[PDB]
Amino acid sequence: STGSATTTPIDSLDDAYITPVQIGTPAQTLNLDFDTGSSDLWVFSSETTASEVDGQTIYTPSKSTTAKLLSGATWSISYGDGSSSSGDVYTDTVSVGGLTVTGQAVESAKKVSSSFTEDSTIDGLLGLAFSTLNTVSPTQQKTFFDNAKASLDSPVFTADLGYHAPGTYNFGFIDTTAYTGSITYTAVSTKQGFWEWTSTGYAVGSGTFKSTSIDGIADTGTTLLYLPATVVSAYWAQVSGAKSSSSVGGYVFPCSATLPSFTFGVGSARIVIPGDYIDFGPISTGSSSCFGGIQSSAGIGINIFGDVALKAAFVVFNGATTPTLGFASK
């Protein structure tokens, strides 16, 4: 089997991407944030504290003839940005782009933190990291991909995120028309439950490539590119007037600037992030200070190849017995 679904930016900045997901019978379609950095499929629901729902579409398990309460199971998750959610668990039929999994754990939120409430466009998350990170207790549950894997034509999914435009998540096949040149594959460590890999270096603009190992995670659920302070300082030094602002929470730059590109290495291959992908617009409405899309990972504890990086590539998440990651230009 295979599946193919379009993923759409939630706003003009590509702050996140939503993908429609069918849950239950008859189908209830929710727009979920596909997140290769976590492993829970959770949704706003009829059980979510009413004051914490503000415009989201909810899953109502009582209206699904295939929903079954997973007795005694609860979940609770906290994300790198300080947001969180928790609740109980159903199993139900879940389909993405024509690919169907029966008996998928659908984690129903009883509580969500303010950042989720305040984002009306995201109805929940669909985790695509390794199932070892799944938070369901006392019986850990499998991700949608893990459940689908054996049925797929090939045990892979691909992320093809757009810049200020829709893109695609495919399951079970590689669309050879969706990228240019070749796909370069690179090793993955699953030790921390992430799609963790080592970039071979970077360049800023038309500058020379610096060969240096940068361990980090391919994370579709993180907006920005978080890299070591040395790398990030080297990038922003090429933008007149750019500076790190503790009050704002990262590097800012004059909105009048033209940003240089940023290149990262994948083995001997190179992925070029155009400068415009690094512009996250005014820090507040009407400001001439703009927020940068490359930020320091210092104090995150891990480097994160988030959407800023991934959207410059066609990315293969290869879930073979020994997983690997593939990157192509597009």
Structural domains of the chain ordered from first start? 5-174 (2.40.70.10), 175-330 (2.40.70.10)
Is 151 among the residues known to form the active site?
no
**PDB experimental method:** X-ray
Is 307 noted as a catalytic residue in this protein?
no
Which three-class secondary structure string do you get for the chain?
A: CCEEEEEEECCCCCCCEEEEEEECCCCEEEEEEEECCCCCEEECECCCCHHHCCCCCCECHHHCCCCEEEEEEEEEEECCCCCEEEEEEEEEEEEECCEEEEEEEEEEEEEECHHHHCCCCCCEEEECCCHHHCCCECCCCCCHHHHHHHHCCCCEEEEECCCCCCEEEEECCCCCCCCCCCCEEEECECCCCCCEEEEEEEEECCCCCEEEEEEEEECCCCCCEEECHHHHHHHHCCCCCCEEECCCCEEEEECCCCCCCEEEEECCEEEEECHHHHEEEECCCCCCEEEECEEECCCCCCEEECHHHHCCCEEEEECCCCCEEEEECC
Task: From the candidates 45, 64, 199, 296, give the one annotated as an active-site residue.
Answer: 199
Out of 35, 40, 88, 279, pick the active-site residue.
Answer: 35
